[PDB]
Design a protein around this ligand. Structure first.
Ligand SMILES: [Mg+2]
Ligand SMILES: [Mg+2]
Ligand SMILES: [Mg+2]
Ligand SMILES: [Mg+2]
Ligand SMILES: [Mg+2]
Ligand SMILES: [Mg+2]
Ligand SMILES: [Mg+2]
Ligand SMILES: [Mg+2]
Ligand SMILES: [Mg+2]
Ligand SMILES: [Mg+2]
Ligand SMILES: [Mg+2]
Ligand SMILES: [Mg+2]
Ligand SMILES: [Mg+2]
Ligand SMILES: [Mg+2]
Ligand SMILES: [Mg+2]
Ligand SMILES: [Mg+2]
Ligand SMILES: [Mg+2]
Ligand SMILES: [Mg+2]
Ligand SMILES: [Mg+2]
Ligand SMILES: [Mg+2]
Ligand SMILES: [Mg+2]
Ligand SMILES: [Mg+2]
Ligand SMILES: [Mg+2]
Ligand SMILES: [Mg+2]
Ligand SMILES: [Mg+2]
Ligand SMILES: [Mg+2]
Ligand SMILES: [Mg+2]
Ligand SMILES: [Mg+2]
Ligand SMILES: [Mg+2]
Ligand SMILES: [Mg+2]
Ligand SMILES: [Mg+2]
Ligand SMILES: [Mg+2]
Ligand SMILES: [Mg+2]
Ligand SMILES: [Mg+2]
Ligand SMILES: [Mg+2]
Ligand SMILES: [Mg+2]
Ligand SMILES: [Mg+2]
Ligand SMILES: [Mg+2]
Ligand SMILES: [Mg+2]
Ligand SMILES: [Mg+2]
Ligand SMILES: [Mg+2]
Ligand SMILES: [Mg+2]
Ligand SMILES: [Mg+2]
Ligand SMILES: [Mg+2]
Ligand SMILES: [Mg+2]
Ligand SMILES: [Mg+2]
Ligand SMILES: [Mg+2]
Lengths: 201, 261, 150
RNA sequence: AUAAGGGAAGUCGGCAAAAUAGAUCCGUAACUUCGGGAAAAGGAUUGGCUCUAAGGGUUGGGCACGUUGCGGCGUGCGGUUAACAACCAACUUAGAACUGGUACGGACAGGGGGAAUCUGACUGUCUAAUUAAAACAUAGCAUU
RNA sequence: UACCUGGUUGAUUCUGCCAGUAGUCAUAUGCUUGUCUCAAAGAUUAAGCCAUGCAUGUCUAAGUAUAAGCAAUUAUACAGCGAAACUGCGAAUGGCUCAUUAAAUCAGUUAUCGUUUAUUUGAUAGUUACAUGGAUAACCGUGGUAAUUCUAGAGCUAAUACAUGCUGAAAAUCCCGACUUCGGAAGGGAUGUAUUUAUUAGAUUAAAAACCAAUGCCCUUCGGGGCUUUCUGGUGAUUCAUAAUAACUUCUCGAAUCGCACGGCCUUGCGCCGGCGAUGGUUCAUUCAAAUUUCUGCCCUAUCAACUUUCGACGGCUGGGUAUUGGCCAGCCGUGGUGACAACGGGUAACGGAGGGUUAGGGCUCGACCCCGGAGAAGGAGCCUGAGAAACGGCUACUACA
RNA sequence: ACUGGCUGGGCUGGGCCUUUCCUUCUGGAGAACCGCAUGCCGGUGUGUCGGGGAACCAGGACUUUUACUCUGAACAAAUUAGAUCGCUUAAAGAAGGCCUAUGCUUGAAUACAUUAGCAUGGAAUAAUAGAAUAGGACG
């Protein structure tokens, strides 16, 4: 089948090499698996030495970790928006490592409300459709929460705007074809400015 | 070549086994175990070729099936079991104990030891580090791993092994003034005192030794095996590894022969 | 070396596992711990150049601030080509001995090595290189020191 | 204008008809006056639709005084935006996916080719109304 | 044993080749042939074609026994020896051959901080239970086809085959907090290991202060004198070893297995406890290794002087794939790499080396062949099982034979 | 063959002074030369005595760079050279030997390769580098 040896190549002087031996059991290759966004579907493959790998054909959710805060929550992926290597990867909504995606921001906002007693990204006050208040069953919690809010600090405006829409930018940092999982982190800071300028221009 | 080998050709076996080039085409092919294949002492070679207790291959395994012979206090039942340096071989029915140690010519020799000395060993340490759960451990030259060692013990040292409970009881640092025995190279079997050591960054440091007769020699660090500071802990064989020249051997040979007869 | 910009590519260039967006600010002397530039020492009496520690370039093949370890032979030669990007060609000369005629003859070989942006290399200079893992089809050595010009 | 199977067996003779044909990318011999032969010979691709990338123009640039109905000049200087920002404008080229009764220079337009012999070097000219040729002319060469 | 003689001329001294002389683990052939010790042998021309037979199987006290099996007669669950069949392991080692191959194989010397590893050896894993559920072979019985180590449908029964499954402990660490006197707290959840991602620690190795913010405290005459301080391994070199936190997974492992001995406690219940082996099992170490990899070294030829990038040729970057590195492959961007110190191409009656033959010294020539490395099973390609094969005494297809 | 001697003459090597001699810091253990008192017949154990560190070991920094030669390390068995032992001799083989033993004892050495790579001593011969627009050395 597919081979990844260097015998068929051409030497650095330009000379053409001669036939040496038939293809070997090692040095083989395998058909690439193009992950897509959809209902979960994974195949098992028996690799060298009796181990196993996990082919991911369709995925829709995975772990994503918030850097500054330090929380990791499972959420779903909406779509692929940028890819530094090839544009056709973006159009197909096929996801690999170092692919910029958009994820649901619901689980991360909820944790912020419980940890800090302040609201994050709420411009629905004009509509006030879903305004609701729950009685706080203590008063030391404000002492605990106000200490956290005054100490750690506040979110920068760039990340706050995304929370209003409910969509967040992330980068896949796993290899779905190998491990069968799509994992990443929320990108922020100067790295956010690089992609936002490149994304719409 | 499509897998691992399982045959050993005679004329390709290690030289220090002293095997005749005739009478067969193959060699014992020592099985995998604690000692390297190049420098090991298969049990069949020891029992049949040196002690001459067993006449041939067929009767060599007859002895082993009766669990008569054991090494390091545990019975072994395969004829091609790789024994090596410092190993203790005990045969209770005949009533003697053996220790495998090099002579001055770089080969294994028979060496009687007393029963009181046949209940401990010593081996060079290979690595020290932290294992699973943070428990420190070390591994010796014969693939013995022991947890919770003395923090003062470092690599290249030697440790005395109980051989009944497998616990370290005292150790020797690796430094100048120690008494050492060589295990590899052309100076194999010599005994000397470490004079000084020179190290080269990038590997392959060398150490300079000195014999009892003021002779001098050098070897790589991987072939030096500390066996004591003074008055070596183990009992050395006859000749004590002094490496007489060819001139003295024939002088001593005739002097001993004519004196006796 | 001369590099116009550090971020001039499709992706974002950064050292792996060096976290850069922390709410609390802590000042530490350690290179990689606090969030500032990371670098190491190769050893074998090789000193880290000043340009490496205080520079802003990003390179994953440089022996300094990189993911390559140097082990094996150390060789010397003279550079003959500097017309690629972060790669040079050195020339090594020796003498082969012909036993029958009891005298020698000249021979030479050509070698390819990776040069880091820390150094500035021109044609006709002597360099010292060290072995590393395969970085390309024909690159297995890395530049370590540039000898002074006459 | 079209024809099953055969494909010049017709005839003084392939006379008449058929076949080839646009553009883009590959490939190309003997011979030679080294300019040619050459479009040699011989192969592949071509619609519709939804997208991606490249090739341009114009106007804006910091202080310190003086004139003047937020500024145009007088200047005194400094700096080279690790080239940014707004607005404006036609066409030409390359690449990818999906789609069909595998069709797409869809009509029109549009070279058959190869191996040799005889003869005039070539472009050019003539028997208006039966002969356009190997005939005439030509540069070059020689004589009076 | 550092050696020479015949032949051009009427005769002479030379250059010069032809011929003679000796060896060969170097093959053939002619004539002849009594004994002892040793024993090469279808390599050369055809890696041309092959009738018949053989060359790979395997059971211990210890995985499964209702043989209309044998043998005894202590075993009313089984119990001695034990065909058949299921299950486990091996069949990838040996043995044969030299077609291809000219920096390729190979030799000596390095590297793996760039990977996989059955087996052997040494350590090591507290989260209905007095025992869970359906199938199948041998066997009985009924058949098909000229034909093969072809197989059908019907009826019984096993597992170390296949598939499920049980906090027996506390402490500590980290979140939520029922409830106030505002200074800590009822009780509630998670917390082994493997898998995947993000974050934190992993110290230095000469010393004396003086300030801002404010708290475990000791002594104490209440004016306070004040404040000594606990760990941290390794390499020439790392983001190493190892540990902690937030989460994740068609998701693992942590024993429903087997044989010998016949023992000890008292609340005497067909109760509790207890020894040595076999076979398995997660991670680290070791062993037999395997795959890649650094430096230098090969015969003749210029009537072979420029070569490499159509459709990767040299390098940069982001990924894909692989046990892992890598232009090994996919996209985007630069214009390089080798050569008179002989590249590139053609010849080889060419597998490489240890080494054989012949000798003053220096050399010339041969090496298919018992040892080591590589490749192949008529010619090409593809793949299953497995720790390990691109296997041919394994399978699928085309070509050529039969 | 043993032993001593020659103001024995030679050969190989190590120390000092001649303008030259030999880098440097930290630590280890500790001598020689010194005096202190305590004891025998002008020398000596004296002791957690001190002025004191010859040499040695471990660690850090500095030193123009190659070729060449010396000594080491690492590297295969068989083969070549070669030591030992009367297979009845020999080509071979790795065996055997001793009184008599219900036992004892030994051998299976050593050299060579040789190009490349890794260390060490030497500093002749052949190349190479340094202060001249001082961009030089030292405190
Ligand atoms: Mg090393
Ligand atoms: Mg017709
Ligand atoms: Mg027709
Ligand atoms: Mg036709
Ligand atoms: Mg006709
Ligand atoms: Mg006609
Ligand atoms: Mg016509
Ligand atoms: Mg027509
Ligand atoms: Mg032309
Ligand atoms: Mg043309
Ligand atoms: Mg054409
Ligand atoms: Mg033509
Ligand atoms: Mg098209
Ligand atoms: Mg056409
Ligand atoms: Mg047409
Ligand atoms: Mg004409
Ligand atoms: Mg007319
Ligand atoms: Mg006409
Ligand atoms: Mg001669
Ligand atoms: Mg003549
Ligand atoms: Mg004559
Ligand atoms: Mg002759
Ligand atoms: Mg006779
Ligand atoms: Mg043949
Ligand atoms: Mg039985
Ligand atoms: Mg087995
Ligand atoms: Mg098998
Ligand atoms: Mg084989
Ligand atoms: Mg044969
Ligand atoms: Mg085990
Ligand atoms: Mg099972
Ligand atoms: Mg780590
Ligand atoms: Mg890469
Ligand atoms: Mg050039
Ligand atoms: Mg040859
Ligand atoms: Mg051949
Ligand atoms: Mg050969
Ligand atoms: Mg042949
Ligand atoms: Mg032969
Ligand atoms: Mg054949
Ligand atoms: Mg297996
Ligand atoms: Mg094969
Ligand atoms: Mg095959
Ligand atoms: Mg066969
Ligand atoms: Mg076979
Ligand atoms: Mg002999
Ligand atoms: Mg030297």
């Amino acid at each position: 089948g597919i081979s990844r040896d260097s015998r068929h190549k051409r030497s650095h002087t330009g000379a053409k090499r001669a036939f040496y031996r038939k293809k070997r059991a090692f040095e083989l290759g395998r058909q690439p698996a193009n992950t897509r966004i959809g209902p979960k579907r994974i195949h098992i493959v028996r690799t060298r030495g009796g181990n196993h790998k996990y082919r991911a054909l369709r995925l829709d959710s995975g772990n994503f970790a918030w850097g500054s805060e330090g929380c990791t929550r499972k959420t779903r992926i909406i779509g692929v928006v940028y890819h530094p290597s090839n544009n056709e990867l973006v159009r197909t909504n096929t996801l690999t490592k170092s692919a910029v995606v958009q994820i649901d921001a619901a689980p991360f906002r909820q944790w912020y409300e419980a940890h800090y007693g302040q609201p994050l990204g709420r411009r629905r006050q004009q509509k006030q459709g879903q305004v609701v208040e729950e009685v706080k069953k203590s008063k030391s919690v404000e002492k605990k929460q106000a200490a956290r809010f005054a100490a750690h600090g506040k979110v920068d405006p760039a990340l706050e705007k995304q929370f209003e829409a409910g969509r967040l930018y992330a980068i896949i940092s796993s290899r779905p074809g190998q491990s069968g999982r799509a994992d990443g982190y929320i990108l922020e800071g100067e790295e956010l400015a690089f992609y936002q300028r490149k994304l719409h221009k | 070549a499509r897998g691992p080998k399982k045959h050993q050709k005679r004329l390709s076996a290690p030289s220090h086994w002293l095997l005749d080039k005739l009478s067969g085409a193959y060699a014992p092919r020592p099985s995998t175990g604690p000692h390297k294949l190049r420098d090991c002492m298969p049990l069949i070679v020891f029992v049949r070729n040196r002690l001459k207790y067993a006449l041939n291959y067929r009767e060599t395994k007859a002895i082993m099936m009766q669990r008569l012979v054991k090494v390091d206090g545990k019975v072994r039942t395969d004829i091609t079991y790789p024994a090596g340096f410092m190993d203790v071989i005990t045969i209770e029915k005949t009533g003697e104990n053996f220790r495998l140690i090099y002579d001055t010519k770089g080969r294994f020799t028979v060496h009687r030891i007393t029963d009181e000395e046949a209940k401990y060993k010593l081996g060079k340490v290979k690595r020290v580090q932290l294992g699973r759960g943070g428990v420190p451990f070390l591994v010796t030259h014969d693939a013995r791993t022991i947890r919770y060692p003395d923090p003062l013990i470092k690599v290249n040292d030697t440790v005395k092994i109980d051989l009944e409970t497998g616990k370290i009881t005292d150790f020797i640092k690796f430094d100048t003034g120690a008494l050492a025995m060589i295990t590899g190279g052309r100076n194999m079997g010599r005994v000397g005192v470490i004079t000084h050591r020179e190290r080269h960054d990038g590997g392959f440091g060398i150490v300079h030794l000195k014999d009892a007769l003021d002779n001098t020699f050098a070897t790589r660090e991987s072939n030096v095996f500390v066996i004591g500071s003074e008055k070596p802990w183990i009992s050395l064989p006859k000749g004590k590894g002094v490496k007489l020249t060819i001139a003295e051997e024939r002088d001593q040979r005739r002097a001993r022969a004519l004196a006796a007869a | 070396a001369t590099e116009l910009t550090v971020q001039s590519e499709r992706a974002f260039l950064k050292q792996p596992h060096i976290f850069l967006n922390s709410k609390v600010k802590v000042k530490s002397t350690r290179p990689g711990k606090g969030g500032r530039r990371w670098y190491k020492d190769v050893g074998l009496g090789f000193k880290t150049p000043k340009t490496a520690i205080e520079g802003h370039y990003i390179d994953k093949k440089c022996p300094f601030t990189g993911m390559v370890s140097i082990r094996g032979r150390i060789l010397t030669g003279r550079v003959v080509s500097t017309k690629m990007h972060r790669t040079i060609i050195i020339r090594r000369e020796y003498l082969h001995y012909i036993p029958k005629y009891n005298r020698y003859e000249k021979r030479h070989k050509n070698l390819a090595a990776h040069v880091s942006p820390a150094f500035r290399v021109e044609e006709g200079d002597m360099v010292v290189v060290g072995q590393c893992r395969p970085l390309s089809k024909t690159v297995r050595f890395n530049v370590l020191r540039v000898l002074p010009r006459t």
